[model samples]
Target: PHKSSLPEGIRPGTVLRIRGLVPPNASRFHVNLLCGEEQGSDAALHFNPRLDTSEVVFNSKEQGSWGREERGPGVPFQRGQPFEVLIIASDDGFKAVVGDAQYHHFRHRLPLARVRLVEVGGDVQLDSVRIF
Candidate 1:
Protein backbone atom coordinates (compact mmCIF):
# COMPACT_ATOMS: atom_id res chain seq x y z
CA PRO A 1 0.00 0.00 0.00
CA HIS A 2 1.03 3.60 -0.68
CA LYS A 3 -0.39 6.76 0.79
CA SER A 4 0.22 10.51 0.46
CA SER A 5 -0.88 13.18 2.88
CA LEU A 6 -3.09 15.92 1.49
CA PRO A 7 -2.42 18.86 3.77
CA GLU A 8 -4.65 21.16 1.75
CA GLY A 9 -7.30 18.50 1.35
CA ILE A 10 -9.60 18.42 -1.70
CA ARG A 11 -12.30 20.76 -2.84
CA PRO A 12 -14.91 21.22 -5.53
CA GLY A 13 -13.42 21.61 -9.01
CA THR A 14 -10.10 20.15 -7.92
CA VAL A 15 -8.53 17.40 -9.95
CA LEU A 16 -6.47 14.49 -8.71
CA ARG A 17 -4.15 12.83 -11.16
CA ILE A 18 -2.58 9.43 -10.79
CA ARG A 19 -0.12 7.81 -13.15
CA GLY A 20 0.55 4.12 -12.80
CA LEU A 21 1.09 0.80 -14.42
CA VAL A 22 -0.57 -2.57 -13.97
CA PRO A 23 1.51 -5.70 -14.31
CA PRO A 24 0.48 -8.54 -16.56
CA ASN A 25 -0.37 -10.70 -13.58
CA ALA A 26 -2.45 -8.10 -11.80
CA SER A 27 -5.85 -9.17 -10.51
CA ARG A 28 -7.06 -5.94 -9.03
CA PHE A 29 -6.07 -2.51 -7.69
CA HIS A 30 -7.60 0.30 -5.67
CA VAL A 31 -7.30 4.07 -5.36
CA ASN A 32 -8.86 5.72 -2.38
CA LEU A 33 -9.43 9.17 -0.98
CA LEU A 34 -9.25 8.86 2.78
CA CYS A 35 -10.52 11.05 5.57
CA GLY A 36 -7.52 10.49 7.82
CA GLU A 37 -4.05 9.00 8.04
CA GLU A 38 -5.21 5.65 9.31
CA GLN A 39 -6.04 2.83 6.91
CA GLY A 40 -9.31 1.98 8.64
CA SER A 41 -10.68 5.53 8.43
CA ASP A 42 -13.53 6.53 6.20
CA ALA A 43 -12.92 6.66 2.47
CA ALA A 44 -14.69 9.35 0.52
CA LEU A 45 -14.04 7.58 -2.70
CA HIS A 46 -12.88 4.08 -3.42
CA PHE A 47 -12.01 3.39 -7.05
CA ASN A 48 -11.19 -0.19 -7.77
CA PRO A 49 -10.34 -1.88 -11.04
CA ARG A 50 -10.57 -5.62 -11.32
CA LEU A 51 -8.66 -7.09 -14.21
CA ASP A 52 -9.81 -10.59 -13.51
CA THR A 53 -13.47 -9.58 -13.81
CA SER A 54 -12.95 -6.83 -16.38
CA GLU A 55 -14.88 -4.29 -14.37
CA VAL A 56 -14.48 -1.13 -12.33
CA VAL A 57 -16.03 -0.65 -8.92
CA PHE A 58 -16.68 2.60 -7.10
CA ASN A 59 -17.97 3.16 -3.61
CA SER A 60 -17.53 5.01 -0.34
CA LYS A 61 -16.66 3.84 3.14
CA GLU A 62 -18.04 5.43 6.27
CA GLN A 63 -16.61 4.56 9.64
CA GLY A 64 -15.40 1.10 8.62
CA SER A 65 -18.24 -0.14 6.48
CA TRP A 66 -18.57 0.31 2.75
CA GLY A 67 -21.62 1.67 1.00
CA ARG A 68 -23.37 0.28 -2.06
CA GLU A 69 -20.97 -0.16 -4.93
CA GLU A 70 -21.35 1.41 -8.38
CA ARG A 71 -19.85 -0.62 -11.16
CA GLY A 72 -18.60 0.63 -14.49
CA PRO A 73 -19.26 -0.91 -17.87
CA GLY A 74 -15.80 -2.29 -18.51
CA VAL A 75 -12.14 -2.01 -17.65
CA PRO A 76 -10.29 0.94 -19.10
CA PHE A 77 -6.76 -0.16 -18.27
CA GLN A 78 -4.52 -2.60 -20.01
CA ARG A 79 -2.04 -4.85 -18.29
CA GLY A 80 1.71 -4.23 -18.60
CA GLN A 81 1.04 -0.66 -19.76
CA PRO A 82 0.92 2.81 -18.34
CA PHE A 83 -2.37 4.43 -17.36
CA GLU A 84 -3.46 7.96 -16.54
CA VAL A 85 -6.32 8.41 -14.11
CA LEU A 86 -7.99 11.69 -13.28
CA ILE A 87 -10.55 12.33 -10.58
CA ILE A 88 -12.37 15.63 -10.71
CA ALA A 89 -14.26 16.74 -7.65
CA SER A 90 -17.62 18.34 -8.13
CA ASP A 91 -20.32 19.58 -5.82
CA ASP A 92 -22.43 16.46 -6.16
CA GLY A 93 -19.85 13.84 -7.01
CA PHE A 94 -16.48 12.93 -8.48
CA LYS A 95 -15.90 12.47 -12.20
CA ALA A 96 -13.19 10.00 -13.09
CA VAL A 97 -11.40 9.89 -16.41
CA VAL A 98 -9.19 7.08 -17.53
CA GLY A 99 -6.73 7.88 -20.25
CA ASP A 100 -8.56 10.49 -22.34
CA ALA A 101 -12.19 9.65 -21.72
CA GLN A 102 -14.65 9.88 -18.87
CA TYR A 103 -14.82 6.55 -17.08
CA HIS A 104 -17.17 6.88 -14.12
CA HIS A 105 -18.79 9.11 -11.54
CA PHE A 106 -19.15 8.49 -7.82
CA ARG A 107 -21.56 10.51 -5.73
CA HIS A 108 -20.16 12.06 -2.58
CA ARG A 109 -21.13 10.09 0.48
CA LEU A 110 -19.41 12.50 2.84
CA PRO A 111 -17.91 15.97 2.85
CA LEU A 112 -15.24 16.11 0.18
CA ALA A 113 -13.09 18.48 2.21
CA ARG A 114 -12.74 15.82 4.88
CA VAL A 115 -10.50 13.83 2.62
CA ARG A 116 -6.90 14.25 3.79
CA LEU A 117 -5.04 11.43 2.13
CA VAL A 118 -4.66 9.55 -1.15
CA GLU A 119 -4.00 5.83 -1.12
CA VAL A 120 -3.08 3.30 -3.80
CA GLY A 121 -2.48 -0.38 -3.44
CA GLY A 122 -3.07 -3.93 -4.62
CA ASP A 123 -1.66 -5.43 -7.80
CA VAL A 124 -0.50 -2.12 -9.27
CA GLN A 125 2.52 0.19 -9.18
CA LEU A 126 2.17 3.94 -9.05
CA ASP A 127 4.58 6.27 -10.78
CA SER A 128 3.20 9.64 -9.68
CA VAL A 129 0.26 11.45 -8.11
CA ARG A 130 -0.70 15.10 -8.21
CA ILE A 131 -3.55 17.35 -7.11
CA PHE A 132 -4.49 20.66 -8.67
Candidate 2:
Protein backbone atom coordinates (compact mmCIF):
# COMPACT_ATOMS: atom_id res chain seq x y z
CA PRO A 1 0.00 0.00 0.00
CA HIS A 2 1.30 3.45 -0.90
CA LYS A 3 0.69 6.78 0.69
CA SER A 4 -1.62 9.55 -0.55
CA SER A 5 1.38 11.10 -2.27
CA LEU A 6 5.13 10.74 -2.72
CA PRO A 7 7.40 10.82 0.26
CA GLU A 8 9.71 13.71 0.95
CA GLY A 9 13.08 13.88 -0.87
CA ILE A 10 12.38 11.44 -3.71
CA ARG A 11 15.53 11.29 -5.81
CA PRO A 12 16.20 11.10 -9.52
CA GLY A 13 15.75 7.85 -11.46
CA THR A 14 12.77 7.36 -9.23
CA VAL A 15 9.80 5.46 -10.64
CA LEU A 16 6.45 6.58 -9.26
CA ARG A 17 3.42 4.28 -9.10
CA ILE A 18 -0.01 5.89 -8.78
CA ARG A 19 -3.38 4.23 -8.23
CA GLY A 20 -6.36 6.50 -7.73
CA LEU A 21 -9.87 7.38 -8.67
CA VAL A 22 -10.82 9.90 -11.30
CA PRO A 23 -14.40 11.07 -11.34
CA PRO A 24 -16.47 8.70 -13.42
CA ASN A 25 -17.73 11.54 -15.53
CA ALA A 26 -14.50 13.44 -15.51
CA SER A 27 -13.89 14.67 -19.01
CA ARG A 28 -10.21 15.57 -18.87
CA PHE A 29 -7.58 15.06 -16.28
CA HIS A 30 -4.26 16.86 -16.14
CA VAL A 31 -1.00 15.65 -14.65
CA ASN A 32 1.99 17.73 -13.81
CA LEU A 33 5.64 16.77 -13.34
CA LEU A 34 7.27 19.46 -11.29
CA CYS A 35 10.73 20.17 -9.92
CA GLY A 36 11.75 21.93 -6.68
CA GLU A 37 10.41 21.59 -3.14
CA GLU A 38 7.86 24.36 -3.26
CA GLN A 39 4.81 23.32 -5.31
CA GLY A 40 3.66 26.84 -6.13
CA SER A 41 7.05 28.25 -7.15
CA ASP A 42 8.29 25.13 -8.94
CA ALA A 43 7.82 24.93 -12.68
CA ALA A 44 6.09 22.23 -14.72
CA LEU A 45 8.66 21.04 -17.25
CA HIS A 46 7.30 19.82 -20.56
CA PHE A 47 8.44 16.44 -21.85
CA ASN A 48 9.71 16.98 -25.37
CA PRO A 49 12.70 14.89 -26.47
CA ARG A 50 12.78 16.00 -30.09
CA LEU A 51 14.96 19.02 -29.45
CA ASP A 52 18.59 18.21 -28.82
CA THR A 53 18.51 20.84 -26.13
CA SER A 54 16.34 20.91 -23.00
CA GLU A 55 13.07 22.65 -23.78
CA VAL A 56 9.66 22.50 -22.12
CA VAL A 57 7.33 20.28 -24.14
CA PHE A 58 3.57 20.58 -23.84
CA ASN A 59 0.48 20.33 -26.00
CA SER A 60 -2.67 22.27 -24.91
CA LYS A 61 -1.54 24.94 -22.51
CA GLU A 62 0.30 28.06 -23.51
CA GLN A 63 4.11 28.36 -23.70
CA GLY A 64 4.88 27.81 -20.01
CA SER A 65 1.79 27.00 -17.94
CA TRP A 66 0.01 23.64 -18.37
CA GLY A 67 -0.62 20.74 -20.78
CA ARG A 68 -2.84 20.91 -23.86
CA GLU A 69 -6.56 20.12 -23.90
CA GLU A 70 -8.57 17.01 -24.85
CA ARG A 71 -7.17 16.07 -28.23
CA GLY A 72 -5.81 12.53 -28.09
CA PRO A 73 -7.91 9.36 -27.88
CA GLY A 74 -10.05 10.77 -25.16
CA VAL A 75 -11.27 8.10 -22.78
CA PRO A 76 -14.02 8.35 -20.23
CA PHE A 77 -12.69 8.56 -16.73
CA GLN A 78 -13.67 5.21 -15.32
CA ARG A 79 -13.94 4.45 -11.69
CA GLY A 80 -11.22 2.25 -10.17
CA GLN A 81 -9.17 2.34 -13.32
CA PRO A 82 -5.67 1.41 -12.34
CA PHE A 83 -3.36 4.00 -13.90
CA GLU A 84 0.41 4.08 -13.78
CA VAL A 85 2.94 6.85 -14.33
CA LEU A 86 6.62 6.20 -14.88
CA ILE A 87 9.03 9.10 -14.54
CA ILE A 88 12.65 8.33 -15.34
CA ALA A 89 14.96 11.18 -14.60
CA SER A 90 18.16 10.51 -16.49
CA ASP A 91 21.40 12.24 -17.38
CA ASP A 92 20.08 13.14 -20.82
CA GLY A 93 16.49 14.10 -20.09
CA PHE A 94 13.24 13.46 -18.25
CA LYS A 95 11.16 10.57 -19.57
CA ALA A 96 7.60 10.15 -18.30
CA VAL A 97 5.08 7.49 -19.21
CA VAL A 98 1.49 7.68 -18.03
CA GLY A 99 -0.38 4.36 -17.96
CA ASP A 100 1.72 2.90 -20.75
CA ALA A 101 1.19 6.16 -22.60
CA GLN A 102 4.27 8.21 -23.36
CA TYR A 103 3.71 11.70 -22.04
CA HIS A 104 6.85 13.81 -21.91
CA HIS A 105 10.41 13.30 -23.13
CA PHE A 106 12.09 16.64 -22.63
CA ARG A 107 15.70 17.58 -22.00
CA HIS A 108 16.53 20.10 -19.32
CA ARG A 109 18.94 23.02 -19.20
CA LEU A 110 18.97 23.04 -15.43
CA PRO A 111 20.03 19.82 -13.68
CA LEU A 112 17.40 17.24 -14.57
CA ALA A 113 20.26 15.05 -15.73
CA ARG A 114 21.09 14.81 -12.07
CA VAL A 115 17.53 14.90 -10.71
CA ARG A 116 18.06 14.02 -7.09
CA LEU A 117 14.70 15.37 -6.00
CA VAL A 118 11.26 15.67 -7.56
CA GLU A 119 7.58 16.36 -6.80
CA VAL A 120 4.49 14.86 -8.42
CA GLY A 121 0.94 16.14 -8.02
CA GLY A 122 -2.33 15.47 -9.79
CA ASP A 123 -6.00 14.79 -9.17
CA VAL A 124 -5.65 11.10 -8.47
CA GLN A 125 -4.66 8.44 -5.98
CA LEU A 126 -0.93 7.80 -5.53
CA ASP A 127 0.09 4.19 -5.04
CA SER A 128 3.85 3.71 -4.73
CA VAL A 129 7.22 5.03 -5.88
CA ARG A 130 10.73 3.63 -6.11
CA ILE A 131 14.08 4.83 -7.45
CA PHE A 132 15.47 2.68 -10.18
Candidate 3:
Protein backbone atom coordinates (compact mmCIF):
# COMPACT_ATOMS: atom_id res chain seq x y z
CA PRO A 1 0.00 0.00 0.00
CA HIS A 2 1.12 3.56 -0.65
CA LYS A 3 2.33 5.46 2.39
CA SER A 4 -0.23 8.10 3.45
CA SER A 5 1.94 10.02 5.89
CA LEU A 6 4.96 10.50 3.66
CA PRO A 7 4.06 14.19 2.99
CA GLU A 8 5.26 14.22 -0.60
CA GLY A 9 4.33 13.21 -4.18
CA ILE A 10 5.15 13.65 -7.88
CA ARG A 11 3.00 15.89 -10.08
CA PRO A 12 4.43 17.09 -13.37
CA GLY A 13 2.56 18.78 -16.23
CA THR A 14 -0.43 18.95 -13.97
CA VAL A 15 -2.60 21.56 -12.26
CA LEU A 16 -3.47 21.13 -8.59
CA ARG A 17 -6.05 22.81 -6.36
CA ILE A 18 -5.21 22.90 -2.65
CA ARG A 19 -7.57 24.04 0.10
CA GLY A 20 -6.58 24.48 3.73
CA LEU A 21 -5.83 26.89 6.55
CA VAL A 22 -2.75 28.26 8.30
CA PRO A 23 -2.33 28.00 12.04
CA PRO A 24 -2.58 31.23 14.03
CA ASN A 25 1.08 31.14 15.01
CA ALA A 26 2.09 30.18 11.51
CA SER A 27 4.17 33.17 10.40
CA ARG A 28 4.12 32.20 6.73
CA PHE A 29 2.53 29.72 4.33
CA HIS A 30 4.61 28.06 1.67
CA VAL A 31 3.60 25.91 -1.27
CA ASN A 32 6.18 23.69 -2.91
CA LEU A 33 5.99 20.95 -5.52
CA LEU A 34 8.74 19.05 -3.73
CA CYS A 35 9.48 20.03 -0.16
CA GLY A 36 10.84 18.23 2.90
CA GLU A 37 11.19 19.15 6.60
CA GLU A 38 13.96 21.64 6.05
CA GLN A 39 13.16 25.33 6.61
CA GLY A 40 14.30 26.49 3.13
CA SER A 41 14.36 23.24 1.19
CA ASP A 42 14.45 23.30 -2.60
CA ALA A 43 11.26 22.43 -4.48
CA ALA A 44 10.67 21.27 -8.04
CA LEU A 45 9.06 23.82 -10.38
CA HIS A 46 7.62 23.37 -13.90
CA PHE A 47 10.76 21.92 -15.42
CA ASN A 48 12.08 18.53 -14.34
CA PRO A 49 15.60 19.74 -13.51
CA ARG A 50 16.96 20.71 -10.08
CA LEU A 51 18.94 23.64 -11.44
CA ASP A 52 15.62 25.36 -12.28
CA THR A 53 14.81 26.06 -8.66
CA SER A 54 13.43 29.50 -7.86
CA GLU A 55 12.29 31.55 -4.87
CA VAL A 56 9.19 32.68 -6.72
CA VAL A 57 7.32 29.52 -5.82
CA PHE A 58 3.93 29.52 -4.07
CA ASN A 59 3.61 31.91 -1.13
CA SER A 60 0.48 33.12 0.70
CA LYS A 61 0.87 35.35 3.76
CA GLU A 62 -2.67 36.52 4.44
CA GLN A 63 -5.71 34.56 5.56
CA GLY A 64 -8.78 33.83 3.41
CA SER A 65 -6.84 35.42 0.59
CA TRP A 66 -6.83 33.90 -2.84
CA GLY A 67 -3.97 34.41 -5.26
CA ARG A 68 -5.85 34.98 -8.49
CA GLU A 69 -9.24 36.35 -7.51
CA GLU A 70 -8.72 37.56 -3.99
CA ARG A 71 -8.55 41.32 -3.52
CA GLY A 72 -6.93 42.92 -0.51
CA PRO A 73 -6.52 40.94 2.69
CA GLY A 74 -9.83 39.23 1.96
CA VAL A 75 -10.43 37.22 5.12
CA PRO A 76 -8.26 35.67 7.72
CA PHE A 77 -8.54 31.94 7.39
CA GLN A 78 -9.77 30.55 10.62
CA ARG A 79 -7.61 28.03 12.41
CA GLY A 80 -9.90 25.20 11.27
CA GLN A 81 -11.46 27.02 8.34
CA PRO A 82 -11.04 25.95 4.74
CA PHE A 83 -8.99 27.48 1.84
CA GLU A 84 -7.85 26.58 -1.65
CA VAL A 85 -4.83 26.68 -4.01
CA LEU A 86 -4.59 26.00 -7.74
CA ILE A 87 -1.21 25.05 -9.23
CA ILE A 88 -0.46 24.85 -12.95
CA ALA A 89 2.79 23.17 -13.98
CA SER A 90 4.57 23.91 -17.23
CA ASP A 91 8.00 23.76 -18.85
CA ASP A 92 8.92 27.18 -17.48
CA GLY A 93 7.75 26.82 -13.89
CA PHE A 94 4.78 26.27 -11.59
CA LYS A 95 2.01 28.89 -11.86
CA ALA A 96 0.21 28.98 -8.53
CA VAL A 97 -3.32 30.41 -8.57
CA VAL A 98 -4.73 30.65 -5.10
CA GLY A 99 -8.46 31.19 -4.82
CA ASP A 100 -8.45 33.65 -7.70
CA ALA A 101 -5.07 35.35 -7.45
CA GLN A 102 -1.84 34.60 -9.29
CA TYR A 103 0.88 34.10 -6.72
CA HIS A 104 4.20 33.29 -8.44
CA HIS A 105 6.11 31.12 -10.88
CA PHE A 106 8.57 28.44 -9.75
CA ARG A 107 11.30 27.13 -12.03
CA HIS A 108 12.48 23.55 -12.19
CA ARG A 109 15.89 22.19 -11.31
CA LEU A 110 18.51 20.58 -13.53
CA PRO A 111 18.03 16.84 -14.25
CA LEU A 112 14.41 17.10 -13.11
CA ALA A 113 12.57 18.09 -16.28
CA ARG A 114 9.21 17.01 -14.92
CA VAL A 115 7.51 17.59 -11.60
CA ARG A 116 5.41 14.56 -10.70
CA LEU A 117 5.51 14.93 -6.91
CA VAL A 118 4.79 17.59 -4.27
CA GLU A 119 4.92 18.12 -0.50
CA VAL A 120 2.76 20.29 1.82
CA GLY A 121 3.98 21.33 5.24
CA GLY A 122 3.84 24.07 7.89
CA ASP A 123 1.09 24.74 10.46
CA VAL A 124 -1.72 24.21 7.97
CA GLN A 125 -4.65 21.89 7.39
CA LEU A 126 -4.41 20.48 3.91
CA ASP A 127 -7.96 19.54 3.15
CA SER A 128 -7.35 17.94 -0.26
CA VAL A 129 -5.73 18.18 -3.71
CA ARG A 130 -7.48 18.30 -7.10
CA ILE A 131 -5.49 17.61 -10.26
CA PHE A 132 -6.60 19.01 -13.59
Candidate 4:
Protein backbone atom coordinates (compact mmCIF):
# COMPACT_ATOMS: atom_id res chain seq x y z
CA PRO A 1 0.00 0.00 0.00
CA HIS A 2 1.11 3.56 -0.75
CA LYS A 3 -0.26 6.57 1.08
CA SER A 4 0.20 10.33 0.85
CA SER A 5 -0.83 13.09 3.17
CA LEU A 6 -3.15 15.72 1.76
CA PRO A 7 -1.76 18.84 3.32
CA GLU A 8 -4.55 21.06 2.09
CA GLY A 9 -7.14 18.32 2.53
CA ILE A 10 -10.37 17.76 0.60
CA ARG A 11 -13.24 20.18 0.68
CA PRO A 12 -16.20 21.28 -1.37
CA GLY A 13 -15.06 22.04 -4.92
CA THR A 14 -11.72 20.37 -4.38
CA VAL A 15 -10.45 17.92 -6.94
CA LEU A 16 -8.02 15.06 -6.56
CA ARG A 17 -6.23 13.89 -9.65
CA ILE A 18 -4.26 10.70 -10.09
CA ARG A 19 -2.30 9.60 -13.13
CA GLY A 20 -1.07 6.03 -13.39
CA LEU A 21 -0.56 2.99 -15.49
CA VAL A 22 -2.58 -0.20 -15.35
CA PRO A 23 -0.30 -3.20 -15.62
CA PRO A 24 -1.08 -6.04 -18.00
CA ASN A 25 -1.46 -8.42 -15.06
CA ALA A 26 -3.71 -6.19 -13.00
CA SER A 27 -6.68 -7.87 -11.44
CA ARG A 28 -7.67 -5.20 -8.96
CA PHE A 29 -6.68 -1.90 -7.37
CA HIS A 30 -8.00 0.59 -4.84
CA VAL A 31 -7.88 4.32 -4.11
CA ASN A 32 -9.03 5.63 -0.78
CA LEU A 33 -9.52 8.94 1.00
CA LEU A 34 -8.65 8.32 4.62
CA CYS A 35 -9.30 10.06 7.87
CA GLY A 36 -5.84 9.58 9.27
CA GLU A 37 -2.56 7.71 9.00
CA GLU A 38 -3.56 4.61 10.93
CA GLN A 39 -4.83 1.36 9.54
CA GLY A 40 -8.51 0.72 10.30
CA SER A 41 -9.27 4.43 10.28
CA ASP A 42 -12.32 5.70 8.46
CA ALA A 43 -12.28 6.03 4.71
CA ALA A 44 -14.39 8.85 3.37
CA LEU A 45 -14.41 7.34 -0.07
CA HIS A 46 -13.19 4.00 -1.34
CA PHE A 47 -12.83 3.51 -5.08
CA ASN A 48 -11.98 0.03 -6.16
CA PRO A 49 -11.73 -1.42 -9.64
CA ARG A 50 -11.74 -5.14 -10.28
CA LEU A 51 -10.48 -5.83 -13.76
CA ASP A 52 -11.05 -9.56 -13.39
CA THR A 53 -14.72 -8.92 -12.70
CA SER A 54 -15.01 -5.83 -14.88
CA GLU A 55 -16.65 -3.76 -12.19
CA VAL A 56 -16.04 -0.69 -10.11
CA VAL A 57 -16.91 -0.66 -6.39
CA PHE A 58 -17.41 2.43 -4.31
CA ASN A 59 -18.03 2.63 -0.61
CA SER A 60 -16.86 3.93 2.74
CA LYS A 61 -15.41 2.43 5.89
CA GLU A 62 -15.82 3.55 9.45
CA GLN A 63 -14.26 2.12 12.58
CA GLY A 64 -12.71 -0.70 10.58
CA SER A 65 -16.03 -1.86 9.10
CA TRP A 66 -17.22 -1.24 5.56
CA GLY A 67 -20.42 0.43 4.56
CA ARG A 68 -22.88 -0.63 1.85
CA GLU A 69 -21.09 -0.74 -1.48
CA GLU A 70 -22.14 1.20 -4.56
CA ARG A 71 -21.20 -0.73 -7.63
CA GLY A 72 -20.97 0.79 -11.07
CA PRO A 73 -20.07 0.01 -14.69
CA GLY A 74 -17.25 -2.08 -16.09
CA VAL A 75 -13.59 -1.27 -15.93
CA PRO A 76 -12.59 1.81 -17.96
CA PHE A 77 -8.88 1.15 -17.74
CA GLN A 78 -6.89 -0.60 -20.39
CA ARG A 79 -4.18 -3.03 -19.54
CA GLY A 80 -0.62 -1.66 -19.91
CA GLN A 81 -1.98 1.79 -20.66
CA PRO A 82 -1.92 5.11 -18.90
CA PHE A 83 -5.05 6.60 -17.34
CA GLU A 84 -6.19 9.69 -15.55
CA VAL A 85 -8.53 9.58 -12.55
CA LEU A 86 -10.32 12.49 -11.03
CA ILE A 87 -12.25 12.67 -7.79
CA ILE A 88 -14.31 15.78 -7.23
CA ALA A 89 -15.75 16.51 -3.83
CA SER A 90 -19.09 18.22 -3.69
CA ASP A 91 -21.83 18.89 -1.18
CA ASP A 92 -23.70 15.69 -1.93
CA GLY A 93 -21.05 13.18 -2.90
CA PHE A 94 -17.90 12.48 -4.78
CA LYS A 95 -17.89 12.43 -8.57
CA ALA A 96 -15.22 10.26 -10.11
CA VAL A 97 -14.00 10.57 -13.65
CA VAL A 98 -12.02 7.77 -15.21
CA GLY A 99 -9.88 8.97 -18.07
CA ASP A 100 -12.07 11.79 -19.40
CA ALA A 101 -15.51 10.45 -18.61
CA GLN A 102 -17.61 10.43 -15.50
CA TYR A 103 -17.50 6.94 -14.06
CA HIS A 104 -19.28 6.94 -10.68
CA HIS A 105 -20.55 8.84 -7.72
CA PHE A 106 -20.28 7.83 -4.06
CA ARG A 107 -22.35 9.62 -1.46
CA HIS A 108 -20.62 11.11 1.50
CA ARG A 109 -20.90 8.71 4.41
CA LEU A 110 -18.75 10.65 6.81
CA PRO A 111 -17.72 14.26 7.24
CA LEU A 112 -15.38 15.12 4.40
CA ALA A 113 -13.32 17.25 6.73
CA ARG A 114 -12.04 14.14 8.40
CA VAL A 115 -10.20 13.02 5.32
CA ARG A 116 -6.54 13.88 5.56
CA LEU A 117 -4.82 11.23 3.49
CA VAL A 118 -5.00 9.41 0.20
CA GLU A 119 -3.90 5.84 -0.47
CA VAL A 120 -3.32 3.87 -3.64
CA GLY A 121 -2.42 0.24 -3.99
CA GLY A 122 -2.65 -3.04 -5.85
CA ASP A 123 -1.63 -3.72 -9.42
CA VAL A 124 -0.98 -0.09 -10.30
CA GLN A 125 2.02 2.10 -11.01
CA LEU A 126 1.30 5.63 -9.88
CA ASP A 127 2.90 8.45 -11.82
CA SER A 128 1.44 11.43 -10.05
CA VAL A 129 -1.13 12.56 -7.47
CA ARG A 130 -2.36 16.11 -7.10
CA ILE A 131 -5.10 17.86 -5.11
CA PHE A 132 -6.41 21.28 -6.01
* Highest TM-score model number: 1
Model with the higher TM-score, candidate 2 or 4 = 4
lDDT of model 1 at position 131? 83
- Could you arrange the candidates by TM-score from highest to lowest? 1, 4, 3, 2
lDDT of 2 at 129: 49
Report the number of clashing residue pairs per model. 0, 7, 32, 0
By lDDT, the best candidate is: 1
lDDT (Cα, tens digit) per residue for candidate 3, span 63-100: 22323222223233344456676777676656666566
The better candidate by lDDT, 1 or 2, is: 1
Candidate 4: 10-residue stretch with minimal lDDT: 1-10
lDDT of 2 by residue, 1-132 (tens): 122233353346655544445444333334444443343433334322211222323432223455442222324235446666566656565566766676556554444432223343333445554445
Q: Give the TM-score of candidate 1.
A: 0.94
> What TM-score would every model get versus the actual structure?
0.94, 0.49, 0.52, 0.94
* Alpha-carbon runs more than 4 Å astray in model 4: none
The TM-score, computed over Cα atoms with residue i paired to residue i, of candidate 3 is 0.52
The per-model lDDT (C-alpha) reads 0.91, 0.43, 0.45, 0.89
lDDT of 4 by residue, 7-117 (tens): 667789988889999899999899999998877889999999888888989999988899999998878987789999999999898999987788898888899888899
Which ten residues in a row are the worst by lDDT in model 2?
47-56
- Candidate with better lDDT, 2 vs 4: 4
Ranking by lDDT: 1, 4, 3, 2
lDDT of 4 at 126: 90
